[PDB]
């Protein structure tokens, strides 16, 4: 009853039943079906995760947030948040009125918002396409809030209708990410409070949708337009109280005035994200060369940075406002497009790539003038 | 027998071995093994996107009765998949489909080994539909619901819902076992199972480096497509390109030519003269971009990255801003860009953002939703890009689009995705991105600055660069600027760069002279004149493609109607010859032909 | 200012259908 | 066969007859094909191009490559059969006779054993005895076409492939797209130059190298509803049309001239009436624009640029900004340069921008955007 | 075979089982000189519901009987060809153009029959609209060479949704205007039709029965129009009189009071119209006589042809606009209050006046 929406009491349960049977037929070729008998097979079903799980998926649940920590760099209060959403309704302690985990992932662009939840779908899952990504900002009138649901009856696209709706039936549980919800339009809204209220949602053929289990992902970039400055009016003395206080409150203030307070009523927790930092940022590094590494690998090669081409990479590549975009974007300036003249030389070949920075950087200065050295070695 | 008459039998055809293996599927076959252990609805649904192996599994069941993989209760029950098409084909009188199809239904249960395999279950509603005649599942549903017939179904997840979810008491009476997309460590071990299969039939050796190839590649680059039949259609149609060689090797290579010549995407690996043609990029753009260096560079360098295996595979091969005065060969280089890439300019997908006047011409971008006119057409960007995933996408005046255009296209930069309406996912990971917008010289282009300050000629650039990324940061929201990979602001054209677009410009007029048996020499004083009349510094090359249509264009033109100049060698010298310095502005071209 | 959502409807679609005859 | 000619016609035996036109070019793509047949999971290929790039033609020329035996030997002397999905569903009043029909074609494919179906407009078997979610044509062939049982050409525009093919997804998984891209204009030429004796036969006329030229390039140029090979023979059999109702040869007067009755470009070979009326085009002009003399020059510059082929094609003839003050022959000029180009003032296309004072009129323009009243 | 989808009005006139026209022959002229043409001689009669344009082509199937029709008219049958009849009843491919060529056929079989297709807007939509064959695109081709004579009828806003948006449909049809009558002109329609319900209700009906029946129903029925809602009220009166034999002006002035609503039938009202205002409104009767005494005039004596019925300025105030409403035609709620301290801008002037085309607010 409660974790399908498809099916009918006297059968949806007959069915746990007479597969749970059948399983345990199968494990002997006496047996019971227990609670967790069921649960097996609900899971094994819907694909929600209500069994008694083992002993190597609890120690990881525990240990989520530093499994988290994996993928996203910093971002400590974000990464627990969502370990306390799923820790919660896997400990069999959700609400079961609500959505597993409601939670805005604003502040600003680039410290790991859609980061984080690609980071939840793949520790959830193990891949980013299992993340239900509905990029809003494609959504901008309030007629585009057909693709959500689907057209209704007898109206072209009726067929194929709903693609918000219909991978959510297929998926009840699926951590769902509404990028750049702001650019949508507001009477999306008040089709998506639904949602966060009951936990059902029409869609446009009047069927009720299961969103009890969605982790819904609200990624915003409001009350950044004076954040993408570093510096704010006056005077004050340094850091500390910049970076998050002051920034939490223009985001929050602009999500007030932005969002219905309906819709913020019932959203476990806004988060608003800290920009990334000196020691984060260096962090984010060896993060960002490892994809790059991951592919020269494919071309059975190494790159290894030194310790001094990583510390110039976080130099050059930290905007205190973006962060980990213009780190990415000096590493494709000064070690990937620098890689592939060296990889179509035919300069770099197959062993070690030292790639390390020697013209100066003399371990710190501003380094502008030091240039990065790719070595070949065996 | 008469079941084999409309019918498959597939334990038959597993004992045989003309079913291929299935290697994984573990899973999936045992769950299907206990929804036909059942009592009640004995009748499991595969349903899954189109080639994720639906049938695969059931022809993997197949061979797990037959080598006795199966449970007791499931031993030695033969598999028949019930061909729909072949119970109505003759059934022309009333009670012939349902003759059969009873008919069908006694010798399950007089035999009580058979499991039906209705292949495309959704096809069951219909199939005996002659409005003097019942349903085919109206047949069934009593049976199936009672567990009195053991039936496997197989359905893709859209026609599930299509055909399927629109009758609720028959999606009621089976399963829904989700058969999902596997995994490319789980299709390389998929394609290292149907290795013999493939080999054995093209007369190759498939290299396990062309699994791995096939998988990631397929993986990757296919959008459409699902893993367990994209990575054995690379598999396959390489397999047989090598069989087309005598008339043995498959290797990472040869995987890569197959999804090249599939996806138009280039992946495969490189000839010496197509590696140093992109060593030679920027100068082979600048025999078509002159100056521009910072921005030929710019794009070599993505192009590069790309070509190199080094592009974020998550992300556009390039996303650029060509940023900077009118006329200096912003569109001129995306242009370039693209006849590099290509070959013709007709390759540049060139979304022109000046149509683009409020928020609801968005639609033609990725089509209308569900439920409005012209949900048909999946909107101009998505399809070209659709069509061809290896492409260069120029947003032209960019800066002219409506403001909520950027946030559609937010999600192309960062993830390389925009759905259409439709709701297909169209892949940009492969596209160049070019937006090209005139920002912060719509005006400052006119020299002179507000107030004091020193230099001029390149504290104007400093100046324009400074003018430019201003206006870019307060047009556009901060996200959208941090999710291009460059911003190239560009050059004002320079009086050196003027002298050599007018041997560009006049190799355009000298060619339509080719196709009327002329020639067009054109003197190096008359080079020079062209070169001062059209010099402009604030816009550069388009005043001097008016030079060049006054002066020049429009004179041979009546000379050519005079046919004072027909097929002979115009020589055009300049004749007051302005000095060669100072003002030539009494100076006059005179147009002969001789020869 | 405002847009007017023109809708397209779907159709119904008359059928052709085969029959059954008896003799 | 017996029964796969009543529904359908033999290709390769019409390549045998030569009643297929030489198909020039296309190896990359007929090979492409080859590759596809000679598969053994899906040896099905779809060519996916636009409506008269040569996809019908990519799979004559196949035919006539297993004809001459230029086909690998795994597709050596296989019989190609046009299916002609009309001819399946003719007939059939009676429920499993169109179903009947079908499994007796899949039968004698079997039997024979070499046998490719050419599907043409396979967008057509998505529904061929009834819906998608009941017993079609496609439904049938789904099963065979999953496990290469069944060696099927088909043939659909890229507006099809998405319309027809993709709105049954299962269906597009079974073929494997092959895109015939529109040729260039030195590829077509290429054609036309293999084309040349069908046209020069059916029509009795001697078509010059020239006009092979002067077709690609201009119907490349001039026409922008229609792709390359099939607008260039379109101007070939057009002037072999006109030629043979004169009644020796076509040259590029003839083919641009019917470029000019088609498009209503003028790009034909002038007269020396209408070269002299473009030389007196600033008098003509003068007949009704009294003075405004720098006006009358410049936009009888653009049309003898246009008119001597010194028109850069990337570019419109002439854009003119006139300015001045009121009454003095900005309108009158635009009126008087279309009664020169045409003898009418109902051929200028005012566009009265007074209308336009809206940011959101640019609609009247363009038209509406899918979604809206207006997009039709 | 005709006759399946509609009775010939030409042999309904010859048996007489025809309503005569008394009036409107000029319209009947303008038909005829439309059919008389070659090329389209394909008259649309452009009304509204209620007009007489079934009554147009009655007295054009009486004026053929009479001979009073032009040489390329005589001997013509009419036939009411229903086109929602040949919708009706068909469910599959095929079956709609089956029985619109049985039709046809029968056009080019006689080669005197002039269809008479009430609500030709629906011409445009009977198969595909115009997606594919309807029953347009097969009549199209034989209405643009004068082969098949059809005399349309359509509201002329359907005219102008459904026949003037199919550019190609338009020029094969030629509008006649048929102009909603005057109340003189529908005393005299009423006339003639004495006779026939005479003869059916049995009854008797007086001279001003028709002037009360006329003048009244322009009074108190705008959704219908004249001559039918004055047909309308004289039908009814008779269907008092099938309860109790001579109709009065009270007999319909009932028989409206059934229609409507109100019972209120202005002299006599007008002059004691003060007491029925303080049945609402005690206290402050000074402008209750005051309001009471400009009405006198507007509505008793002389009018301006352009002016409202009193204009005035309250400075209960609304409880007596709300009496005032309920002594003006009969009805409690009529008064409208547009609440004007609701706007104060200029923008949203146009919120209470309708909005220009393209902006918020245009309904
Ligand atoms: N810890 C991290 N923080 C931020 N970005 C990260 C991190 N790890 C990796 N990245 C990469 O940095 C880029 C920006 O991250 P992401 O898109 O999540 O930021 P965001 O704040 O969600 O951006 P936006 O506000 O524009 O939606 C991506 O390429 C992402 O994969
Ligand atoms: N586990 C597997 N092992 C081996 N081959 C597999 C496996 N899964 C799928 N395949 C192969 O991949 C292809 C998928 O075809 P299949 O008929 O199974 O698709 P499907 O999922 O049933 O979808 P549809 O019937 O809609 O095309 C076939 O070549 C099949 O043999
Ligand atoms: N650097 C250049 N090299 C070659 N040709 C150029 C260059 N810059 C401009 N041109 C020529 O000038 C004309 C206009 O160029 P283009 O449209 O690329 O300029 P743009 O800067 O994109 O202009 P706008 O800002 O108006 O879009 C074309 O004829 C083009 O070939
Ligand atoms: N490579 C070629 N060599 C010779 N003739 C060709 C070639 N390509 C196309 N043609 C000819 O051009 C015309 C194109 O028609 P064809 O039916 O082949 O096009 P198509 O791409 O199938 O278009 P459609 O989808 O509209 O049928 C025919 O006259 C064809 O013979
Ligand atoms: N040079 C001219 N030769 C002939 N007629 C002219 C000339 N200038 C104006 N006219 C007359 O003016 C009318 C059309 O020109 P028109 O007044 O539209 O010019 P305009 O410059 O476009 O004016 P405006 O700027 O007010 O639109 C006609 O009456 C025409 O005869
Ligand atoms: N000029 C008229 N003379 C007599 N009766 C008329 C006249 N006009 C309309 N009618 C009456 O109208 C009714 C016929 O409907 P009609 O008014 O023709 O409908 P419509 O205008 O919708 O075609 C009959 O009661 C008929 O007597
Ligand atoms: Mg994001
Ligand atoms: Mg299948
Ligand atoms: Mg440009
Ligand atoms: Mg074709
Ligand atoms: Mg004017």
């Given at each position: 009853?409660?974790?399908?929406?498809?099916?009918?009491?006297?059968?949806?349960?007959?069915?746990?039943?007479?597969?749970?049977?059948?399983?345990?037929?199968?494990?002997?070729?006496?047996?019971?079906?227990?609670?967790?008998?069921?649960?097996?097979?609900?899971?094994?079903?819907?694909?929600?995760?209500?069994?008694?799980?083992?002993?190597?998926?609890?120690?990881?649940?525990?240990?989520?947030?530093?499994?988290?920590?994996?993928?996203?760099?910093?971002?400590?209060?974000?990464?627990?948040?969502?370990?306390?959403?799923?820790?919660?309704?896997?400990?069999?302690?959700?609400?079961?009125?609500?959505?597993?985990?409601?939670?805005?992932?604003?502040?600003?662009?680039?410290?790991?918002?859609?980061?984080?939840?690609?980071?939840?779908?793949?520790?959830?899952?193990?891949?980013?396409?299992?993340?239900?990504?509905?990029?809003?900002?494609?959504?901008?009138?309030?007629?585009?809030?057909?693709?959500?649901?689907?057209?209704?009856?007898?109206?072209?696209?009726?067929?194929?209708?709903?693609?918000?709706?219909?991978?959510?039936?297929?998926?009840?549980?699926?951590?769902?990410?509404?990028?750049?919800?702001?650019?949508?339009?507001?009477?999306?809204?008040?089709?998506?409070?639904?949602?966060?209220?009951?936990?059902?949602?029409?869609?446009?053929?009047?069927?009720?949708?299961?969103?009890?289990?969605?982790?819904?992902?609200?990624?915003?970039?409001?009350?950044?337009?004076?954040?993408?400055?570093?510096?704010?009016?006056?005077?004050?003395?340094?850091?500390?109280?910049?970076?998050?206080?002051?920034?939490?409150?223009?985001?929050?203030?602009?999500?007030?005035?932005?969002?219905?307070?309906?819709?913020?009523?019932?959203?476990?927790?806004?988060?608003?994200?800290?920009?990334?930092?000196?020691?984060?940022?260096?962090?984010?590094?060896?993060?960002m060369i490892?994809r790059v590494?991951?592919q020269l690998?494919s071309k059975?090669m190494?790159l290894?940075?030194?310790?001094?081409a990583?510390?110039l990479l976080?130099?050059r590549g930290?905007?205190?406002?973006?962060?980990?975009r213009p780190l990415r974007r000096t590493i494709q300036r000064e070690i990937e497009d620098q890689l592939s003249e060296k990889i179509l030389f035919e300069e770099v070949g197959?062993?070690?790539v030292?790639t390390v920075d020697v013209d100066?950087?003399?371990?710190?200065?501003?380094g502008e003038d030091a240039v990065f050295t790719f070595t070949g070695?065996? | 027998?008469?079941?084999?008459?409309?019918?498959?039998?597939?334990?038959?055809?597993?004992?045989?071995?003309?079913?291929?293996?299935?290697?994984?599927?573990?899973?999936?076959?045992?769950?299907?093994?206990?929804?036909?252990?059942?009592?009640?609805?004995?009748?499991?649904?595969?349903?899954?996107?189109?080639?994720?192996?639906?049938?695969?599994?059931?022809?993997?069941?197949?061979?797990?009765?037959?080598?006795?993989?199966?449970?007791?209760?499931?031993?030695?029950?033969?598999?028949?998949?019930?061909?729909?098409?072949?119970?109505?084909?003759?059934?022309?009188?009333?009670?012939?489909?349902?003759?059969?199809?009873?008919?069908?239904?006694?010798?399950?249960?007089?035999?009580?080994?058979?499991?039906?395999?209705?292949?495309?279950?959704?096809?069951?509603?219909?199939?005996?539909?002659?409005?003097?005649?019942?349903?085919?599942?109206?047949?069934?549903?009593?049976?199936?619901?009672?567990?009195?017939?053991?039936?496997?179904?197989?359905?893709?997840?859209?026609?599930?819902?299509?055909?399927?979810?629109?009758?609720?008491?028959?999606?009621?009476?089976?399963?829904?076992?989700?058969?999902?997309?596997?995994?490319?460590?789980?299709?390389?071990?998929?394609?290292?199972?149907?290795?013999?299969?493939?080999?054995?039939?093209?007369?190759?050796?498939?290299?396990?480096?062309?699994?791995?190839?096939?998988?990631?590649?397929?993986?990757?680059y296919?959008?459409?497509?699902?893993?367990?039949?994209?990575?054995?259609?690379?598999?396959?149609?390489?397999?047989?390109?090598?069989?087309?060689?005598?008339?043995?090797?498959?290797?990472?290579?040869?995987?890569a030519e197959?999804?090249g010549?599939?996806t138009g995407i280039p992946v495969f690996k490189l000839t010496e003269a197509e590696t140093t043609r992109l060593l030679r990029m920027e100068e082979e753009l600048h025999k078509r971009i002159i100056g521009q260096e910072d921005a030929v560079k710019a794009v070599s360098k993505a192009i590069r990255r790309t070509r190199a295996g080094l592009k974020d595979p998550?992300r556009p091969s390039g996303s650029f801003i060509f940023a900077g005065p009118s006329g200096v060969g912003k569109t001129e280089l995306s242009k370039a860009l693209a006849n590099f890439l290509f070959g013709d300019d007709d390759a540049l997908i060139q979304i022109?953002?000046?149509?683009?006047?409020?928020?609801?011409?968005?639609?033609?971008?990725?089509?209308?939703?569900?439920?409005?006119?012209?949900?048909?057409?999946?909107?101009?960007?998505?399809?070209?890009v659709?069509?061809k995933p290896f492409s260069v996408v120029l947003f032209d005046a960019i800066?002219?689009?409506?403001?909520?255009?950027?946030?559609?296209?937010?999600?192309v930069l960062?993830?390389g995705?925009?759905?259409?309406?439709?709701?297909?996912?169209?892949?940009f990971k492969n596209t160049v991105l070019i937006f090209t917008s005139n920002l912060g010289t719509?005006?400052?282009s006119?020299?002179?600055?507000?107030?004091?300050?020193?230099?001029?000629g390149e504290n104007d650039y400093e100046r324009m660069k400074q003018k430019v990324n201003?206006?870019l940061?307060?047009?556009?929201?901060?996200?959208?600027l941090?999710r291009i990979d460059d911003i190239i602001v560009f050059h004002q054209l320079t009086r050196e760069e003027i002298i050599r677009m007018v041997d560009l410009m006049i190799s355009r007029v000298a060619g339509?002279?080719?196709?009327?048996?002329?020639?067009?020499?054109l003197?190096d004083?008359?080079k020079?004149?062209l070169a001062?009349?059209g010099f402009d510094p604030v816009l550069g090359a388009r005043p001097l493609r008016?030079?060049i249509?006054?002066?020049?264009?429009?004179?041979?033109?009546?000379?050519?109607?005079?046919?004072?100049?027909?097929?002979?060698?115009?020589?055009?010298?300049?004749?007051?010859?302005?000095?060669?310095?100072?003002?030539?502005?009494?100076?006059?071209?005179?147009?002969?032909?001789?020869? | 200012?405002?847009?007017?959502?023109?809708?397209?409807?779907?159709?119904?679609?008359?059928?052709?259908?085969?029959?059954?005859?008896?003799? | 066969?017996?029964?796969?000619?009543?529904?359908?016609?033999?290709?390769?035996?019409?390549?045998?007859?030569?009643?297929?036109?030489?198909?020039?070019?296309?190896?990359?793509?007929?090979?492409?094909?080859?590759?596809?047949?000679?598969?053994?999971?899906?040896?099905?290929?779809?060519?996916?191009?636009?409506?008269?790039?040569?996809?019908?033609?990519?799979?004559?020329?196949?035919?006539?490559?297993?004809?001459?035996?230029?086909?690998?030997?795994?597709?050596?002397?296989?019989?190609?059969?046009?299916?002609?999905?009309?001819?399946?569903?003719?007939?059939?009043?009676?429920?499993?006779?169109?179903?009947?029909?079908?499994?007796?074609?899949?039968?004698?494919?079997?039997?024979?054993?070499?046998?490719?179906?050419?599907?043409?407009?396979?967008?057509?078997?998505?529904?061929?005895?009834?819906?998608?979610?009941?017993?079609?044509?496609?439904?049938?062939?789904?099963?065979?076409?999953?496990?290469?049982?069944?060696?099927?050409?088909?043939?659909?525009?890229?507006?099809?492939?998405?319309?027809?093919?993709?709105?049954?997804?299962?269906?597009?998984?079974?073929?494997?797209?092959?895109?015939?891209?529109?040729?260039t204009?030195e590829?077509?030429?290429?054609?036309?130059?293999?084309?040349?004796?069908?046209?020069?036969?059916?029509?009795?006329?001697?078509?010059?190298?020239?006009?092979?030229?002067?077709?690609?390039?201009?119907?490349?140029?001039?026409?922008?509803?229609?792709?390359?090979?099939?607008?260039?023979?379109?101007?070939?059999?057009?002037?072999?049309?006109?030629?043979?109702?004169?009644?020796?040869?076509?040259?590029?007067?003839?083919?641009?001239?019917?470029?000019?009755?088609?498009?209503?470009?003028?790009?034909?070979?002038?007269?020396?009436?209408?070269?002299?009326?473009?030389?007196?085009?600033?008098?003509?002009?003068?007949?009704?624009?009294?003075?405004?003399?720098?006006?009358?020059?410049?936009?009888?510059?653009?049309?003898?640029?246009?008119?001597?082929?010194?028109?850069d094609?990337k570019?419109?003839?002439?854009?003119?900004?006139?300015?001045?003050?009121?009454?003095?022959?900005?309108?009158?000029?635009?009126?008087?340069?279309?009664?020169?180009?045409?003898?009418?003032?109902?051929?200028?296309?005012?566009?009265?921008?007074?209308?336009?004072?809206?940011?959101?009129?640019?609609?009247?323009?363009?038209?509406?955007?899918?979604?809206?009243?207006?997009?039709?």
């Amino acid at each position: 009853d409660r974790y399908i929406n498809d099916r009918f009491l006297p059968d949806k349960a007959i069915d746990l039943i007479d597969e749970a049977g059948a399983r345990m037929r199968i494990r002997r070729m006496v047996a019971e079906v227990d609670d967790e008998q069921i649960a097996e097979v609900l899971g094994n079903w819907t694909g929600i995760p209500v069994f008694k799980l083992t002993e190597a998926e609890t120690t990881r649940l525990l240990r989520m947030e530093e499994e988290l920590h994996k993928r996203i760099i910093g971002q400590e209060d974000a990464v627990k948040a969502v370990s306390k959403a799923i820790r919660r309704t896997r400990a069999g302690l959700k609400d079961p009125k609500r959505p597993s985990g409601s939670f805005i992932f604003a502040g600003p662009s680039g410290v790991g918002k859609t980061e984080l939840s690609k980071a939840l779908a793949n520790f959830l899952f193990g891949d980013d396409d299992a993340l239900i990504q509905i990029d809003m900002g494609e959504f901008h009138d309030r007629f585009t809030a057909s693709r959500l649901f689907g057209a209704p009856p007898g109206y072209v696209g009726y067929e194929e209708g709903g693609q918000l709706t219909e991978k959510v039936r297929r998926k009840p549980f699926s951590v769902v990410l509404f990028d750049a919800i702001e650019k949508a339009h507001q009477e999306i809204y008040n089709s998506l409070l639904q949602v966060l209220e009951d936990g059902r949602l029409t869609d446009g053929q009047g069927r009720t949708v299961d969103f009890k289990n969605t982790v819904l992902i609200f990624t915003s970039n409001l009350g950044t337009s004076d954040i993408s400055k570093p510096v704010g009016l006056g005077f004050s003395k340094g850091g500390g109280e910049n970076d998050y206080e002051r920034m939490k409150q223009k985001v929050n203030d602009e999500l007030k005035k932005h969002f219905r307070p309906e819709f913020l009523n019932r959203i476990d927790d806004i988060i608003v994200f800290h920009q990334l930092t000196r020691e984060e940022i260096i962090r984010m590094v060896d993060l960002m060369i490892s994809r790059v590494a991951g592919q020269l690998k494919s071309k059975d090669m190494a790159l290894v940075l030194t310790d001094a081409a990583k510390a110039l990479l976080a130099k050059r590549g930290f905007d205190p406002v973006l962060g980990a975009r213009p780190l990415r974007r000096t590493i494709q300036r000064e070690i990937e497009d620098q890689l592939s003249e060296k990889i179509l030389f035919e300069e770099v070949g197959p062993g070690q790539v030292v790639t390390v920075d020697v013209d100066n950087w003399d371990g710190e200065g501003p380094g502008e003038d030091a240039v990065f050295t790719f070595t070949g070695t065996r | 027998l008469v079941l084999d008459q409309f019918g498959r039998n597939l334990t038959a055809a597993a004992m045989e071995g003309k079913l291929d293996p299935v290697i994984g599927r573990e899973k999936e076959i045992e769950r299907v093994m206990q929804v036909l252990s059942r009592r009640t609805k004995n009748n499991p649904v595969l349903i899954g996107e189109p080639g994720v192996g639906k049938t695969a599994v059931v022809e993997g069941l197949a061979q797990a009765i037959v080598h006795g993989e199966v449970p007791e209760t499931l031993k030695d029950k033969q598999l028949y998949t019930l061909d729909l098409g072949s119970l109505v084909a003759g059934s022309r009188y009333r009670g012939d489909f349902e003759e059969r199809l009873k008919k069908v239904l006694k010798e399950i249960n007089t035999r009580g080994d058979i499991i039906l395999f209705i292949d495309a279950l959704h096809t069951l509603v219909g199939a005996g539909a002659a409005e003097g005649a019942i349903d085919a599942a109206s047949i069934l549903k009593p049976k199936l619901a009672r567990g009195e017939l053991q039936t496997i179904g197989a359905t893709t997840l859209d026609e599930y819902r299509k055909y399927i979810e629109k009758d609720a008491a028959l999606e009621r009476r089976f399963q829904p076992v989700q058969v999902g997309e596997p995994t490319v460590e789980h299709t390389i071990e998929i394609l290292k199972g149907l290795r013999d299969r493939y080999e054995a039939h093209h007369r190759v050796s498939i290299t396990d480096a062309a699994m791995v190839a096939a998988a990631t590649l397929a993986d990757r680059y296919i959008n459409d497509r699902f893993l367990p039949d994209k990575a054995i259609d690379l598999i396959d149609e390489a397999g047989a390109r090598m069989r087309i060689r005598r008339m043995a090797e498959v290797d990472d290579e040869q995987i890569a030519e197959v999804l090249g010549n599939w996806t138009g995407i280039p992946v495969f690996k490189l000839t010496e003269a197509e590696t140093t043609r992109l060593l030679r990029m920027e100068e082979e753009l600048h025999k078509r971009i002159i100056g521009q260096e910072d921005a030929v560079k710019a794009v070599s360098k993505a192009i590069r990255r790309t070509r190199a295996g080094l592009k974020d595979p998550k992300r556009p091969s390039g996303s650029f801003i060509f940023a900077g005065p009118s006329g200096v060969g912003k569109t001129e280089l995306s242009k370039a860009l693209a006849n590099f890439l290509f070959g013709d300019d007709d390759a540049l997908i060139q979304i022109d953002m000046g149509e683009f006047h409020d928020r609801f011409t968005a639609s033609r971008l990725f089509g209308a939703p569900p439920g409005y006119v012209g949900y048909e057409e999946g909107g101009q960007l998505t399809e070209k890009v659709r069509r061809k995933p290896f492409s260069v996408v120029l947003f032209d005046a960019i800066e002219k689009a409506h403001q909520e255009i950027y946030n559609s296209l937010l999600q192309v930069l960062e993830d390389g995705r925009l759905t259409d309406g439709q709701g297909r996912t169209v892949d940009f990971k492969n596209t160049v991105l070019i937006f090209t917008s005139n920002l912060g010289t719509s005006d400052i282009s006119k020299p002179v600055g507000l107030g004091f300050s020193k230099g001029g000629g390149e504290n104007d650039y400093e100046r324009m660069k400074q003018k430019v990324n201003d206006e870019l940061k307060k047009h556009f929201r901060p996200e959208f600027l941090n999710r291009i990979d460059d911003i190239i602001v560009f050059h004002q054209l320079t009086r050196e760069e003027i002298i050599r677009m007018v041997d560009l410009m006049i190799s355009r007029v000298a060619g339509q002279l080719k196709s009327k048996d002329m020639a067009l020499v054109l003197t190096d004083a008359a080079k020079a004149l062209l070169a001062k009349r059209g010099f402009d510094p604030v816009l550069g090359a388009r005043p001097l493609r008016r030079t060049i249509q006054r002066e020049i264009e429009d004179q041979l033109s009546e000379k050519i109607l005079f046919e004072e100049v027909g097929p002979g060698q115009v020589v055009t010298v300049d004749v007051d010859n302005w000095d060669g310095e100072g003002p030539g502005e009494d100076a006059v071209f005179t147009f002969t032909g001789t020869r | 200012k405002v847009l007017i959502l023109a809708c397209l409807v779907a159709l119904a679609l008359a059928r052709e259908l085969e029959e059954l005859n008896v003799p | 066969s017996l029964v796969l000619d009543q529904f359908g016609r033999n290709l390769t035996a019409a390549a045998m007859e030569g009643k297929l036109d030489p198909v020039i070019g296309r190896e990359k793509e007929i090979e492409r094909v080859m590759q596809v047949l000679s598969r053994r999971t899906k040896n099905n290929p779809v060519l996916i191009g636009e409506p008269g790039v040569g996809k019908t033609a990519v799979v004559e020329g196949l035919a006539q490559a297993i004809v001459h035996g230029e086909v690998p030997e795994t597709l050596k002397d296989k019989q190609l059969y046009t299916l002609d999905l009309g001819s399946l569903v003719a007939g059939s009043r009676y429920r499993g006779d169109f179903e009947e029909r079908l499994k007796k074609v899949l039968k004698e494919i079997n039997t024979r054993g070499d046998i490719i179906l050419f599907i043409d407009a396979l967008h057509t078997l998505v529904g061929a005895g009834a819906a998608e979610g009941a017993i079609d044509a496609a439904s049938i062939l789904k099963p065979k076409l999953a496990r290469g049982e069944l060696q099927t050409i088909g043939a659909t525009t890229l507006d099809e492939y998405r319309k027809y093919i993709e709105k049954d997804a299962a269906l597009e998984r079974r073929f494997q797209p092959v895109q015939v891209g529109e040729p260039t204009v030195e590829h077509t030429i290429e054609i036309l130059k293999g084309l040349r004796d069908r046209y020069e036969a059916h029509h009795r006329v001697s078509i010059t190298d020239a006009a092979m030229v002067a077709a690609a390039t201009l119907a490349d140029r001039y026409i922008n509803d229609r792709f390359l090979p099939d607008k260039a023979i379109d101007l070939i059999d057009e002037a072999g049309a006109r030629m043979r109702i004169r009644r020796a040869e076509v040259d590029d007067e003839q083919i641009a001239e019917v470029l000019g009755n088609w498009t209503g470009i003028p790009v034909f070979k002038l007269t020396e009436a209408e070269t002299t009326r473009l030389l007196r085009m600033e008098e003509e002009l003068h007949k009704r624009i009294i003075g405004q003399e720098d006006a009358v020059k410049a936009v009888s510059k653009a049309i003898r640029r246009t008119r001597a082929g010194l028109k850069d094609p990337k570019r419109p003839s002439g854009s003119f900004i006139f300015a001045g003050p009121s009454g003095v022959g900005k309108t009158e000029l635009s009126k008087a340069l279309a009664n020169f180009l045409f003898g009418d003032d109902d051929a200028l296309i005012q566009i009265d921008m007074g209308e336009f004072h809206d940011r959101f009129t640019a609609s009247r323009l363009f038209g509406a955007p899918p979604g809206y009243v207006g997009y039709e």
